Amino acid sequence: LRFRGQPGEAKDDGDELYYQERLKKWVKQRSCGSQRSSDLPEWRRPHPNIPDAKLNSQFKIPGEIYSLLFNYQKTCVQWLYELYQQNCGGIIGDEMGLGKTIQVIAFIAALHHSGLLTGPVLIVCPATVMKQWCNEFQHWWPPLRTVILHSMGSGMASDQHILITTYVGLRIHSDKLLKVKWQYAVLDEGHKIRNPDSEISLTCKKLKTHNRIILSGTPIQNNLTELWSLFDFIFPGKLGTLPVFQQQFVIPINIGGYANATNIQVQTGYKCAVALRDLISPYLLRRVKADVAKDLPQKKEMVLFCKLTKYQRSKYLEFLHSSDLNQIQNGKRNVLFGIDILRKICNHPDGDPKRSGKMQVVKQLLLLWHKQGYKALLFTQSRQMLDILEEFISTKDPDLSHLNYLRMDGTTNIKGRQSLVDRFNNESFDVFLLTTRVGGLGVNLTGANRIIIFDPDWNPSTDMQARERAWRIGQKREVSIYRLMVGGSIEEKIYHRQIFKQF
Amino acid sequence: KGSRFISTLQVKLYGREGSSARTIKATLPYIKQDIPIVIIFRALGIIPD
Amino acid sequence: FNMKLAINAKTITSGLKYALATGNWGEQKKAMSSRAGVSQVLNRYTYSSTLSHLRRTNTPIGRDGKLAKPRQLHNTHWGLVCPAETPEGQACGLVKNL
DNA sequence: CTAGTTGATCTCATATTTCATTCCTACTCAGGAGAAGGAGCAGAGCG
RNA sequence: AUCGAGAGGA
DNA sequence: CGCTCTGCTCCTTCTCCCATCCTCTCGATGGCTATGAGATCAACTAG
Establish whether the CB of A13 is closer than 7 Å to any nucleic acid atom in strand F. no
Cα end-to-end distance, chain A, whole Å = 52
Q: Which of A468, A484, A453 is nearest to A382 (CA)?
A: A453
Indicate the resolution in Å. 5.8
Assign residue A22 a region (left: φ > 0; alpha: ψ between -120 and 50; beta: otherwise).
beta
Residue ranges for the known binding site of A are: 94-101
Torsion angles phi and psi, residue C59, rounded to 5:
-85, 165
CB A137 within 8 A of CB A186: no
Q: Which nucleotide is nearest to A499 (CA to C1')?
A: D15
Whole-number Å distance between alpha carbons of A485 and A379: 12
Burial, A385: exposed, middle or buried (Cβ in 10 Å; 0-12, 13-18, 19+)?
buried
Partner residues linked to A377 by β-bridges: A432, A451
CB A483 within 8 A of CB A378: no
CA distances from A254 to A226, A249, A265, A277, A361 (A): 14, 9, 11, 16, 39
Whole-number Å distance between alpha carbons of A183 and A211: 7
CB A185 within 8 A of CB A213: yes
Establish whether the CB of A194 is closer than 7 Å to any nucleic acid atom in strand D. yes
Helices H / strands E in chain C, number of each = 2, 2
Sign, Cα dihedral of A197, A200, A203, A207: negative
Write out which nucleotides of chain E lie closer than 7 A to a protein Cβ. Answer: 5-10
Q: Which amino acid is at A389?
A: L
CB A369 within 8 A of CB A378: no
CA of C77 to C1' of F16 (A): 37
Pairing of strands B10-13, B24-27: antiparallel
Establish whether the CB of A336 is closer than 7 Å to any nucleic acid atom in strand F. yes
Establish whether the CB of C46 is closer than 7 Å to any nucleic acid atom in strand D. no
Torsion angles phi and psi, residue C57, rounded to 5:
-120, 130
Residue ranges for the known binding site of A for ATP are: 94-101
Assign residue A193 a region (left: φ > 0; alpha: ψ between -120 and 50; beta: otherwise).
alpha
CA distances from C56 to A496, C91, C93, C97 (A): 63, 11, 11, 5
Strands ordered across the beta sheet of B10-13: B10-13, B24-27, B35-36
CB A355 within 8 A of CB A349: yes
Whole-number Å distance between alpha carbons of A154 and A15: 11
Assign residue A285 a region (left: φ > 0; alpha: ψ between -120 and 50; beta: otherwise).
beta
Burial, A392: exposed, middle or buried (Cβ in 10 Å; 0-12, 13-18, 19+)?
buried
Helices H / strands E in chain A, number of each = 24, 13
Strand F near-CB residues (< 7 Å), A 102-141: 126-128
Whole-number Å distance between alpha carbons of A124 and A134: 11
CA of B35 to C1' of F3 (A): 39
CA of A126 to C1' of D3 (A): 25
CB A161 within 8 A of CB A192: no
Buried b (16+ CB within 10 A) or exposed e, A32-64: eebbbeebbeebeeeeebebbbeeeeebbbbbb
Whole-number Å distance between alpha carbons of A65 and A105: 8
User: Residue A282: how many CB atoms within 10 A of its CB?
Assistant: 12
Q: Which of B25, B28, B22 is nearest to B7 (CA)?
A: B28
CB A164 within 8 A of CB A148: yes
CA of A186 to C1' of D11 (A): 26
String of DSSP letters for A346-383 = HH-----GGG-HHHHHHHHHHHHHHHHT--EEEEES-H
A500 in helix, strand or coil?
helix
CB A361 within 8 A of CB A484: yes
Would you give the DSSP letter of residue C59?
A: P
Q: What angle do CA A177, A84, A151 make, to 5 degrees?
A: 20
Whole-number Å distance between alpha carbons of A292 and A96: 12
Strand F near-CB residues (< 7 Å), C 6-25: 18, 21-22
Residues with CB under 7 A from strand E: C 23, 34, 36-37, 40, 87-91, 94
Torsion angles phi and psi, residue A406, rounded to 5:
-145, 145
CA of A439 to C1' of F35 (A): 17
Q: Which nucleotide is nearest to A438 (CA to C1')?
A: F37
- Method by which the coordinates were obtained: cryo-EM
Whole-number Å distance between alpha carbons of A478 and A476: 7
CB A107 within 8 A of CB A77: yes
CB A380 within 8 A of CB A405: no
User: Residue A333: how many CB atoms within 10 A of its CB?
Assistant: 8
The subunits that touch chain C, with at least 3 C-beta pairs less than 8 Å apart, are none
Whole-number Å distance between alpha carbons of B26 and B28: 6
Q: Which of A464, A417, A461 is nearest to A443 (CA)?
A: A417
Establish whether the CB of A502 is closer than 7 Å to any nucleic acid atom in strand D. no
Q: What angle do CA A14, A17, A19 make, to 5 degrees?
A: 105
Whole-number Å distance between alpha carbons of A287 and A77: 11
CA-atom Rg of chain C in angstroms? 18
Q: Which amino acid is at C69?
A: K
Cα end-to-end distance, chain C, whole Å = 49
Strand F near-CB residues (< 7 Å), A 137-166: 166
Establish whether the CB of A331 is closer than 7 Å to any nucleic acid atom in strand D. yes
Buried b (16+ CB within 10 A) or exposed e, A237-271: eebbbbeebeebbbebbebbbeeeeeebeeeebbe
Whole-number Å distance between alpha carbons of A483 and A303: 4
Write out which nucleotides of chain D lie closer than 7 A to a protein Cβ. Answer: 6-8, 12-19, 26-31
Q: Which nucleotide is nearest to C39 (CA to C1')?
A: E6
Question: Could you give the residue ranges of the DSSP H alpha helices within A165-289?
Answer: 167-173, 199-206, 224-234, 242-248, 250-256, 266-277
Establish whether the CB of A383 is closer than 7 Å to any nucleic acid atom in strand F. yes
Strand D near-CB residues (< 7 Å), A 207-246: 226
Breaks (C-N over 2.5 A) in chain A follow: 160, 350
Please list, in sequence order, all residues whose beta carbon lies within 8 angstroms of the beta carbon of residue A361, skipping any fewer than 6 positions away. Answer: A304, A306, A484
Q: Which amino acid is at A503?
A: F
Partner residues linked to C57 by β-bridges: C96
CA of A497 to C1' of D16 (A): 6
Whole-number Å distance between alpha carbons of A472 and A465: 11
Strand F near-CB residues (< 7 Å), C 62-91: 64-65
Buried b (16+ CB within 10 A) or exposed e, B12-22: eeeeeeeeeee
Please list, in sequence order, all residues whose beta carbon lies within 8 angstroms of the beta carbon of residue B42, skipping any fewer than 6 positions away. Answer: none
Whole-number Å distance between alpha carbons of B48 and A34: 113
Q: Which nucleotide is nearest to A408 (CA to C1')?
A: F37
Please list, in sequence order, all residues whose beta carbon lies within 8 angstroms of the beta carbon of residue A213, skipping any fewer than 6 positions away. Answer: A80, A83, A89, A90, A92, A104, A184, A185, A186, A187, A234
Whole-number Å distance between alpha carbons of A59 and A49: 15
Q: What angle do CA A405, A439, A222 make, to 5 degrees?
A: 145
C28 in helix, strand or coil?
coil
Please list, in sequence order, all residues whose beta carbon lies within 8 angstroms of the beta carbon of residue A458, skipping any fewer than 6 positions away. Answer: A494, A497, A498, A501
Q: Which of A425, A478, A429, A422 is nearest to A450 (CA)?
A: A478
CB A491 within 8 A of CB A312: no
Please list, in sequence order, all residues whose beta carbon lies within 8 angstroms of the beta carbon of residue C24, skipping any fewer than 6 positions away. Answer: C32, C33, C34, C35, C36, C39
Assign residue A407 a region (left: φ > 0; alpha: ψ between -120 and 50; beta: otherwise).
beta
Cα end-to-end distance, chain B, whole Å = 36
**C-alpha dihedral, A255 to A261 to A267 to A272, nearest 10°:** 0
Burial, A81: exposed, middle or buried (Cβ in 10 Å; 0-12, 13-18, 19+)?
buried
CA of C25 to C1' of F8 (A): 54
The subunits that touch chain A, with at least 3 C-beta pairs less than 8 Å apart, are none
Q: Which nucleotide is nearest to A330 (CA to C1')?
A: D18
User: Residue A71: how many CB atoms within 10 A of its CB?
Assistant: 9
Tell me how far the alpha carbon of residue A425 is from its chain's centroid: 22
Whole-number Å distance between alpha carbons of A212 and A447: 39
Burial, A162: exposed, middle or buried (Cβ in 10 Å; 0-12, 13-18, 19+)?
buried
Cis ω for the linkage preceding A349 (within 30 of 0): yes
A225 in helix, strand or coil?
helix
CA of A58 to C1' of F3 (A): 102
Strand F near-CB residues (< 7 Å), A 70-109: none
Whole-number Å distance between alpha carbons of A120 and A174: 15
Assign residue A96 a region (left: φ > 0; alpha: ψ between -120 and 50; beta: otherwise).
beta
CB A375 within 8 A of CB A448: yes
Partner residues linked to A186 by β-bridges: A123, A213
Q: Which nucleotide is nearest to A386 (CA to C1')?
A: F36
Torsion angles phi and psi, residue A235, rounded to 5:
-125, 50
Report the run of H or E that residue C58 belongs to, with start and end. Answer: strand C56-58
Q: Which of A181, A225, A187, A224 is nearest to A205 (CA)?
A: A187
Cis ω for the linkage preceding C70 (within 30 of 0): yes
Helix A101-111 with A127-140: angle, nearest 10 deg: 40
Tell me how far the alpha carbon of residue A410 is from its chain's centroid: 16
